Structure 1
Amino acid sequence: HGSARDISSTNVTDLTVSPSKIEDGGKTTVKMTFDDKNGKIQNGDMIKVAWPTSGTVKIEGYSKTVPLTVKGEQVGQAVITPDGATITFNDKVEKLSDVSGFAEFEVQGRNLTQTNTSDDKVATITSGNKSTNVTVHKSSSVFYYKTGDMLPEDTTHVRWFLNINNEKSYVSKDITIKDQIQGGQQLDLSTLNINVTGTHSNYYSGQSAITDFEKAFPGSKITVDNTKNTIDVTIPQGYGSYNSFSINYKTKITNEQQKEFVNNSQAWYQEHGKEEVNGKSFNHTVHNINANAGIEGTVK
């Protein structure tokens, strides 16, 4: 083996990113194709896919590891990281002739400077001699809404956010949130944490996150059933008023092949001056990351 040979400039034939126009924090798919027309692929050879990691635009590759297989035999590996993508070939690729393949993976585009100056919002993804462009457009809230995403550095977990009383308005009754986490994922209790902003501004994190919250706010109860994957939040009207409650938590993925991860929640609240909300649905769905890699060759 020895040192890894960068064969991106010689072997890469096409690099395409679709869609070419995305919003801030949007997802887009990158495809890289290669063949051994210009040079025979050897053991230890690597193909690199590079993109901007800092500046005006940021591209973050969702962490995935996809094997390159010919007739059940693994001949290569596709490793995607938040800062780069690498295609590494082993000794089993040397027995193959007329070799051709591809690497398809999803990335996240970010507009860091938040700009509309055309050239700054364009992210250039490169692989050898091939280059392609991605346009990343730059970025009042309701009382309660629920959202979530998957981190580019960690694909095994799905983040969830329970944003309660976002405008810090006075409330006439006790705020009740009944959350239900659907199948294909398991709640990690240690990754809870609650962020409170307003009159009672404090951040509660760690193992004692629930205990410290219930002590600082008497009457409050974050009931967690780990087996049933349900979180029941009760906040008294005295502490619910003039305060914003952001409840985060991570869910470990048990079903790898599952395409959608769903979280459901019902809300009971009434802003003083507004109509009473009685069990209105506030649901969110997070899509799983798609990554595929194929390779063809003749054993001869």
Structure 2
Amino acid sequence: ERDYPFFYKVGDLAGESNQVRWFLNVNLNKSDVTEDISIADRQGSGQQLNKESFTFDIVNDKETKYISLAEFEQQGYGKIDFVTDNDFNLRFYRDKARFTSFIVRYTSTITEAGQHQATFENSYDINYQLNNQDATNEKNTSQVKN
């Protein structure tokens, strides 16, 4: 099994025209967690977040599920909060995140100004805590070449 970071984010320009496909890769190695996982996401310029595009690829040693944002929340996995049109906070509750990976897929529409950018960016601040470890806080910015 490949050794992935607890969290990483990437994107590409595959599929739909004038859209950026983003991916939030959470706990791919299915480690245990001692608290909720909280992501504060601030999207870069030249993009308009498609708030209805979110899907969740959830996997553990019991089952594989691909659900919508509404289902993600209805089933007790977590909650999202769109704080602006392009910024959102996403939380994964402790219990269902234990030994479970989440690949969150969503898109953003590329604006006229965005079409002329060299790259597309998305920044995040994530808080989480693993077993026998102190809480972790990571911040970074991912880029997609245009």
Q: When the two structures are superposed, what TM-score results if normalisation uses the length of structure 1? A: 0.45
Q: Deviations over 1:52-96 (max 9, x none)?
A: xxxxxxxxxxxxxxxxxxxxxxxxxxxxxxxxxxxxxxxxxxxxx
- Radius of gyration: which is bigger? 1
1-structure distance, mates of 2:94, 2:9: 20
User: What residue is the counterpart of 2:81 in the other structure?
Assistant: 223
Which of structures 1 and 2 has the larger relative contact order (alpha carbons within 8 angstroms, sep 6+)? 2
**Equivalent in 94, 101, 107 of residue 237 of structure 1:** 94
Q: 1:217 & 1:157 partners in 2: Cα distance?
A: 30
Which one of the candidate residues 93, 106, 115 is aligned to 1:249? 106
Q: Which runs of 5+ in 1 are unaligned?
A: 1-139, 289-300
* TM alignment of 1:160-199, pairs within 5 A: 160-198=22-60, 199=62
| Residues 11-160 of structure 1 aligned to structure 2 (within 5 Å) | 140-151=3-14, 153-160=15-22
Match of 1:202 in 2: 65
Amino acid at match of 1:166: L
Shift of 1:203: 0.6
Shift of 1:287: 1.4
1:281 counterpart (111, 134, 139): 139
| Percent of paired sites with the same residue | 30
User: Separation in 2 of the partners of 1:174 and 1:211?
Assistant: 19
Kept in 2, the 8 Å contact 1:187–1:226? The answer is no
Q: CA deviation at 1:283?
A: 1.9
Shift of residue 275, structure 1, vs aligned partner: 3.8
For residue 266 of structure 1, report the CA deviation from its aligned partner: 0.7
Match of 1:259 in 2: 118
User: Is residue 269 from structure 1 mapped to residue 128 from structure 2 by the alignment?
Assistant: yes
How far did 1:223 drift? 1.4
Post-superposition Cα deviations, 1:240-293, rounded to whole Å, max 9, x if no partner, equal 101101111111100221111110011100110334212x113201111xxxxx
3-state SS of paired residue (1:212): helix
Count of residues in correspondence between the two structures: 141
Cα distance in 1 for residues equivalent to 2:133 and 2:5: 12
Q: CA RMSD in A?
A: 1.6
Q: CA deviation at 1:155?
A: 4.0
Which secondary structure state, in structure 2, belongs to the residue aligned with residue 160 of structure 1? strand
